[PDB]
Amino acid sequence: MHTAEFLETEPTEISSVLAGGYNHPLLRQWQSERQLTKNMLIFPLFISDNPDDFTEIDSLPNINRIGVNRLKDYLKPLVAKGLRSVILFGVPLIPGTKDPVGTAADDPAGPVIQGIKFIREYFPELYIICDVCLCEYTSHGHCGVLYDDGTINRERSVSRLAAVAVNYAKAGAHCVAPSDMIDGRIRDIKRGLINANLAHKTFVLSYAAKFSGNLYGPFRDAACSAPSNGDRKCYQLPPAGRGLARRALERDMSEGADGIIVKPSTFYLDIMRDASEICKDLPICAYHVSGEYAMLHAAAEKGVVDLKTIAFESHQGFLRAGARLIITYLAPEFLDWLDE
Amino acid sequence: DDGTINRERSVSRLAAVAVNYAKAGAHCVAPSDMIDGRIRDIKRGLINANLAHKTFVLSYAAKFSGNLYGPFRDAACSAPSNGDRKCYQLPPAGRGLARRALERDMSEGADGIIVKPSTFYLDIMRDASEICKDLPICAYHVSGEYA
Amino acid sequence: MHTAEFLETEPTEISSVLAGGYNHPLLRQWQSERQLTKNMLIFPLFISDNPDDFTEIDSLPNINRIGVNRLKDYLKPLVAKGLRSVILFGVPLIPGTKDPVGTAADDPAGPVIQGIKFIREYFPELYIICDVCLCEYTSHGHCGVLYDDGTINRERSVSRLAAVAVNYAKAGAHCVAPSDMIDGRIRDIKRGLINANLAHKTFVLSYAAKFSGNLYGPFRDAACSAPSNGDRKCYQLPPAGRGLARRALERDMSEGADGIIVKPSTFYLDIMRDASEICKDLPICAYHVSGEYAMLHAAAEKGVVDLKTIAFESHQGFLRAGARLIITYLAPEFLDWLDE
Amino acid sequence: MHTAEFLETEPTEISSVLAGGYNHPLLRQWQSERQLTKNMLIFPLFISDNPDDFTEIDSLPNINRIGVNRLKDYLKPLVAKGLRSVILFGVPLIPGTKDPVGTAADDPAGPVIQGIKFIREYFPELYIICDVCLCEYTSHGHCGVLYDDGTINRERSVSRLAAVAVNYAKAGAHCVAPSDMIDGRIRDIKRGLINANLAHKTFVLSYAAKFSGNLYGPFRDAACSAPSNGDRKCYQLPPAGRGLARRALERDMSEGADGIIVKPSTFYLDIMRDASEICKDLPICAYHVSGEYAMLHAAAEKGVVDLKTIAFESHQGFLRAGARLIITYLAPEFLDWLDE
Ligand SMILES: *[C@@](O)(CCC(=O)O)[C@@H](C)N
Ligand SMILES: *[C@@](O)(CCC(=O)O)[C@@H](C)N
Ligand SMILES: *[C@@](O)(CCC(=O)O)[C@@H](C)N
Ligand SMILES: *[C@@](O)(CCC(=O)O)[C@@H](C)N
Ligand SMILES: [Zn+2]
Ligand SMILES: [Zn+2]
Ligand SMILES: [Zn+2]
C-alpha cells in the first residue's frame, strides 16, 4: 500500500509564525496600512455642450455624457451619499468647435466652465477638479499643439495649456489636473497660477506617470478624443518605462505638483509603489481607467469574477500600493457599498 | 478537528511530498500551501535526502487570498470545504505580512520566489525585488487574471 | 600510512546551501538579471570620404573603413540578421580637410552626413547614432579647440561641439554621442538641440565615463585620430579616478543625457556598477573598445581562450555590471550566435 | 564655403568643471583612493614533488613548477626586492598519488607541507598562504569528494577540506584559502581551526566569489588539475550570477572568513565593487588568473598593448574596484616596477 509519509520535523521556529496576525476578520482590517473611505473617491463627469444631454456611453457601462440642465438630478443622490469630489471632462459636440490650437478648451460658453459655474452654485461644497488637456478640443485629436510634421510643439503647447489651466481656476475650479504629459507643462502651469494670484488656492494634480497602452478604448467613445496620424507613444510613457516614470514623478514634484496621478492603475501598481517613495510627502492618486473598468465588467458578466468583490480587491490594491486617492467610474457603487 | 490547519503535521506531510517529487525526478519544487515554516522543513527534507544541491526551491512566498482563482477550481478540482483560505493565504491588504513572508522564505532556504496573483499584486513584486534582490522572482498569471 | 582524515562535522546549515539555484543549464539562465538580445547591440561604422572604399583596418580584425557606395552591400546581411543600430565615425582622408577648429566635422559633403543620408534612405528602420567629437577632424588630432599653449579651450570647444551635434541631428541622426569629455559639453549640446526644435527627437548618449589608457591602440589606425603634443590625460579620466567618474556621471545626467556610455568596458566594469546606481533611471551602454576587442582576438589566436566563449563571457559581464546596451565590433558574430 | 559654426553659449556653470582636479601628474595620483604598494602583492608558487624540479609551464609565461631544493635560489631575489607573501599550490607528479578522496592533499611528505616547512625555516618573515582544495589530488580532478553519480558530496567534501586546512595550519601555514566553492566549507574550516587551537593564528581567506568560465586554461597545465566527466559549473558560480555571488560573499563572511578573494579579476571588477560594500570591514583580494595573465602577454606580444602599461592599468583597476590585495603572476615584475 502507498501510505502517507510524514518527515521528522524540528520544533517550530518563532520566526516562521505569521498566522497570529490574520486569523480573524477584524485582523484582516488591522493589517491594512490604509482603509478605503468615501472622501478618497473622485468621480469623472463627461459634460456635453448639449445642455439637455444624458447619453449612455456604450463602451463605458452605466456612465453617461451629461449636459448642465441634467446635472442637478444626477449629482443630487451622489452628494447625498457622500461624494466629495468630481473631475470634469468636456465633450463639445457642436460642429466647427475643434481647431488646431484647441481654442474651445477654455471657452467660457463651453461645457467645462459651464459645469464649473453650475457646480459652484448648486453644490458649493463639492471639490471640483478639471482635466487639463487639448485632445478633446483639437481637430487632430492630439494632446498638444503640433509642428507641421505632426510632432508636438512643446513651447506652444505648454503656453496654451497654462492658459487653459489658469482659466479653469479663474472660473472656479479648485484643482487642475494636466493629463497631456508634455515636457515641463507643470512648471508653466504653476507659474501661470502664481502670476494670476491663484496658486495659493489651486491644487495642481499632475498626471505625472501616464502610460501609453491598450486600456483607454472606451474613453475614446465617451469624450470623443481620438488621435490622428501617429500615436500617443511619443509623450505617453512606454509601458516598460519605469526609469522614465521615476524621472517624470521627480520632475513634476520639482515643478510644483501638489499631488500626482498614476494612470492606468491596476496594471501599474508597481509604479504607485515607486511614487510612494519618490513622492512620499504628496497625495498619490490612482486612475482606474476606462479599459480597466470595462474589463472588470466584462469578466463579471462572463462569470469569471464577482463585480463587487473584484471592485474591492482592485481598489484596496491601489491603497496597498501607496495611493490615498482614487479616480473611479465605480464611485457610485462604492458610495453605497462603504455604508454596508 | 476544529477544521483549522495543523501546522506541524502539515509541514511534515508537505516536506515528504516535496522530497518524493524530487526523488522521482522533479528539478524544482514549488510549495503553494502558505503554511507557516514549510520552506524550512522542505529544505531540511531535501538536505537529509541528499537532493538539496539538485533541487530548486521555488516558494510561493506571497500568495494572496481573493477573487482571481475561479477557473482554477474547475481545472484541478481543488475546492475547499467549510471555512475559506483566508487564514493562510494572505489578505489582499496585507503588505506587511507579504514583506515578512518574503523575508521568512528566503531565510528558510528558498532559491526563488513566486508572487501570486500577478497583475493585481505588481506592487508586491516591486517590494520583493528589494527584499529578494539576489533571488529570481516569478510572477504567476493566475486563472482568473487569464480568463 | 598517511590516510585521508575527515573532521567531525555538524549538520548542514540551510544558510550555507546555495547550490539548489544553479544545478541545471536553464537555472544558469534564470540567475541572469539581464539576458543578451540582438536589439542591445550597436555596431560601429568607419565611413571614408572615398565613396568606393572598403579597406581592412590592419589592427582591428575583420573591420573595414567603408565608403558610401559600399555600404548597402555591407549592411544588407547585417540588418537582415537583426541589426538595430549603428554608430558612425567619420574618417576623411582627402588632404587639406583637417584644420584647428574641425571645420569638416559637420561638412554636409563629409562622410558622416553622407552616411546619415544614405542610411536614412536605404535602411529607414536602422537607428543612427553619431559619435560627436573634433579629433578626427582637427589638424592637431585633439578632441577640442586649443588655446595657444596647446591646452583645450573649454568655451570654444563646447560651442563648436554643440554645433556639430545639432547639425548631425538636422541631417537625420537619431542620436548624438559626445566622446570629447570636455567639461559641460552636454549642457551646451542639449540647449543646442532645444533651440533647434530637435531635443524631443534626439537621444543624447553621453560618453560620461571615458578613461585614458592603453586600450585604444587600433582605433588610432581605423579613424586616423592621433593626438599631437601632450596626451589625452587632461580630459579623459585617469584610470584610478573613480571619484571623478562618479561626478562625471552625475554631471552629464544633470545636463541632459538620456543615456550614458562607460568606456572602456571589461577593464572598467566596477564603473558600470557605480553608474547603475547613480544613473539608475537611464540606459547604460558599454563600449567594447578597439584594444579590448583586439586583445580577445590575440588571446584566442594564441590558444589562451576560445573566441566565441570569451566573447559571451565578456559581453554577459557588461550586462551583469548594469549595462543594457553594448557598442561592439563583435556585433556581426553575435547576430549569428544569438540565433543558435 | 562650408565654415566652422559655433553656437551661442552661456557662461560656464561651476558644477560642470571637473578639470581642476586632474591636470597634473601628481593629481592623477591624488585621485586614486588606493595606491599600489609592494606589500599588497601575493605571488603563487607551484611546488613539485620532484625536489629538483624547475620546469617552465608552457602556457603560463615566465612561471615554473619548482621543487623544494630549487626554492631558496628562486625566492631569494624576490624577498630581497620586497616580496611579503606567497600562495602555495601542490603539483604531485609521482604516480599512484591521486585517489578519490584526495588523500595526498595533506601528506606531510607532499610538496605543500614540505614547502611550508622549507619556507618557515629559510624565509621566516615570509607570510605563507596555502590554497585549500582537493582537485590537484583527486583522481577525477574535481574539487570535492563525489557521490557515485559524479556529483559532489557536500558533507564528506567539507569534512575532508576542513582536515586539509587544519593540517596545513598545523604544519605552519599562516593562512588557508579554500578555493573549492562547496556550500558551507568556511564554517567547517573555521570550526576545525577553533577545535585545533589555531583560529587565533590562522587567517581564513575565502575564495568567496569564484566564477566558472574560460579564463583558467593555462592553470590546468601548471597544476595538472583537470576535471573529468561533467564541468565545474555546478559549484563555480555562473558568470551571470551576481545574486549568487552576493549571497556567497555574505555567507562566507558569516561563517568566519577574515578576507575574501574575487576570481577571476578584470572580467569581474563589478563583483569586487559589490564585495566592497557587502564585505566592507574585510580585506578584499583580486586573483589575476592564468587566462587573464596569458591574455595580457598574448596581446602585448601582438602589439595591441604595452605589457607594463596594461599591467599597471589592470592592477590599478583592482584597487579602484575595492581590492586591497592582489594575487598575481606579475608580482616579480611589480617588485621591480614599484621601485621606479
Ligand atoms: C485619460 O487617458 C482618460 C481616462 C480613461 O480612459 O478613463 C486622460 C484623457 N485623462
Ligand atoms: C494557485 O492558487 C493556482 C493558480 C491558478 O489559479 O491559476 C495554486 C493552487 N498553485
Ligand atoms: C573612442 O575612444 C574610440 C573607441 C575605440 O577605440 O574602439 C572614441 C573616439 N569614440
Ligand atoms: C584557481 O581556479 C586557479 C588560479 C589560476 O588559474 O591562475 C584555483 C584552482 N585556485
Ligand atoms: Zn489629452
Ligand atoms: Zn575625440
Ligand atoms: Zn579545486
Bridge partners, residue A89, by sequence: A46
Environment of ion ligand 5 (residues, CB < 5 A): A 133, 135, 143
Active site residue D210: yes
Question: Ligand 1: does its nearest atom lie under 6 Å from the Cβ of A289?
Answer: yes
Question: Ligand 3: does its nearest atom lie under 6 Å from the Cβ of C293?
Answer: no
What is the helix, strand, coil percentage profile of chain D, to 5? 40, 15, 45
Distance (Å) from CA A60 to ligand 1 centroid: 12
Domain that holds residue D115: 1-340
Residues A65, A55 contacting (CB under 8 angstroms): yes
Continuous segment of H or E residues that includes residue D91: strand D85-91
Residue B9: count of CB within 10 angstroms of its CB: 11
Read off the DSSP letter of residue D338. Answer: T
SS3 readout for D281-296: CCCEEEEECHHHHHHH
Question: Ligand 1: does its nearest atom lie under 6 Å from the Cβ of A136?
Answer: no
A-chain residues near B19 (CB < 8 A): 7
Pick the closest to residue C20 from D243, B110, D315 (CA basis): B110
Considering only CB atoms, B27 lies closest to which of C15, C19, C24, namely C24
Q: What is the resolution of this structure in A?
A: 1.6
Distance of CA A48 to the CA centre of its chain: 19
Q: Say whether D313 and C215 touch across the interface (CB within 8 A).
A: yes
Given ligand 2 and candidates B17, B28, B29, B32, which is best to mutate, with the most ligand atoms within 8 Å of its CB?
B32
The dihedral built from the CA positions of residue C159, C233, C61 and C330, taken in this order, carries a sign that is: negative
Q: Indicate the length of chain B as a whole number.
A: 147
Identify whether D264 is preceded by a cis peptide bond (ω within 30 of 0): yes
Phi-psi region of D211 (alpha: psi -120 to 50; beta: other; left: phi over 0): beta
CATH number at residue C78: 3.20.20.70
Active site residue B133: no
| Per-position DSSP letters for C262-330, written without gaps between them | EES-GGGHHHHHHHHHHTTTS-EEEEE-HHHHHHHHHHHHTTSS-HHHHHHHHHHHHHHTT-SEEEETT
Distance (Å) from CA D141 to ligand 7 centroid: 8
Q: How many CA atoms lie within 13 A of C275 on its CB side?
A: 36
Residue of C nearest to A234 (CA): C200
Distance (Å) from CA A87 to ligand 1 centroid: 11
Q: What are phi and psi for residue A277, nearest 5 degrees?
A: -95, -50
Domain count, chain D: 1
Given ligand 4 and candidates D46, D134, D263, which is best to mutate, with the most ligand atoms within 8 Å of its CB?
D263
Distance of CA A278 to the CA centre of its chain: 19
Residues B31, B14 contacting (CB under 8 angstroms): yes
- Three-state DSSP at D189 gives helix
End-to-end CA separation in angstroms for chain C? 53
Q: What are phi and psi for residue C65, nearest 5 degrees?
A: -90, 130
- Three-state DSSP at D218 gives coil
Indicate contact of C with D: 3+ CB pairs under 8 A.
yes
Residue of C nearest to B113 (CA): C21
Question: Ligand 1: does its nearest atom lie under 6 Å from the Cβ of A216?
Answer: yes
Question: Ligand 4: does its nearest atom lie under 6 Å from the Cβ of D50?
Answer: no
β-strand A175-178 against A127-132: which pairing, if any? parallel
Which of A313, A314, A324 best probes binding to B when mutated, by most B CB atoms within 10 angstroms?
A: A313
Q: Say whether B111 and C24 touch across the interface (CB within 8 A).
A: no
